[PDB]
Each structure stands twice: as C-alpha cells, then as structure tokens.
UniProtKB/Swiss-Prot annotation, chains B, C:
This protein's encoding gene: GRM3
Function per UniProt: G-protein coupled receptor for glutamate. Ligand binding causes a conformation change that triggers signaling via guanine nucleotide-binding proteins (G proteins) and modulates the activity of down-stream effectors. Signaling inhibits adenylate cyclase activity.
Topological domains annotated Extracellular: 26-49
Subcellular location: Cell membrane
The protein's assembly and partners: Interacts with TAMALIN.
Tissue/organ expression: Detected in brain cortex, thalamus, subthalamic nucleus, substantia nigra, hypothalamus, hippocampus, corpus callosum, caudate nucleus and amygdala.
Residues of the full protein shown: 685 to 733 of 879
Positions of transmembrane segments: 5-25
Species annotation: Homo sapiens (Human)
Record-given protein name: Metabotropic glutamate receptor 3
Family recorded in the similarity comment: Belongs to the G-protein coupled receptor 3 family.
Length: 48, 49, 49
C-alpha cells in the first residue's frame, strides 16, 4: 500500500493492502468448511 | 469391578495431567498463518505447531 | 463395586459439563473493580459476577 505517493509500503504477511489504495486490512482467512464438498463425506461417516 | 475402573481412571488422570500442562504452557490461541509465498489468504491455525 | 461409582461419576460429570459449558459461554478473565466514590482502589476480580 502506498501510504505516501512517493512511498509504497508492505502491510506484512498478516495484513494486506486494500484495493482502494487507502490502507491495510487483516487478510482474509481460510479453513475447512461444510459448504459443498470435502467435509460432507467424513461428517456423514462420523454420524453413521 | 472396582480396581479395573480405578486403574483406568489412573491412566486417564496421567493423560489429564499431561494435557493439562500442555494447555497451561500453550493456552488456546490462533495464529494467522499466511502463505507468504502466495499471500491473500490466512489460516486460523491453533497457536501451537 | 460398579454402579455406585458409575452413578457418582455420572453426577460429577453432569456438574463438570455444566461448568464447562458455562466457561465456554462466559470465558474466564480478570476485571478491574474501582470505587468511583472512593477512587485510588483497584480490585482484581475473577470475571464472574
């Protein structure tokens, strides 16, 4: 993120520069979920 | 009927003490483990490897 | 030798489940109790009223 015009700044691995070039935000998170696939099989197996 | 349960709970309590010191040294928390090679993603991993 | 212990641990486990879900809902911590009428008094309190 370019905090100043003459100075681009990296917000770090934990954060990420916003797409509006206004600042930095906590980067989006990822984890295994029950949405469509993958987890349904093991969940049904455990329930059975 | 009694000493079997006693020994089972003794072993379970040994495990309980081990896991208790494990969590005492490693109180629950989340690390924002990001793929620094890839970025744009965060894994909310537990606070211990 | 068996059912006495089973029932006793059943009751104990019921209480443990209740207290554990209660700490899940109202996670432990410490709060600062200060008497505005008195001031200069800070009390470390277990987070439970």
């Amino acid at each position: 993120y370019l905090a100043d015009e003459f100075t681009c700044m990296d917000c770090g691995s934990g954060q990420w520069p916003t797409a509006d070039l206004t600042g930095c935000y906590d980067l989006p998170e990822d984890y295994i979920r029950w949405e469509d696939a993958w987890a349904i099989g093991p969940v049904t197996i455990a329930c059975l | 009927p009694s000493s079997q349960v006693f020994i089972c709970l003794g072993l379970i309590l040994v495990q309980i003490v081990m896991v208790s010191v494990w969590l005492i040294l490693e109180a629950p928390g989340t690390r924002r483990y990001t793929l620094a090679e890839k970025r744009e993603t965060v894994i909310l991993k537990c606070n211990v490897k």
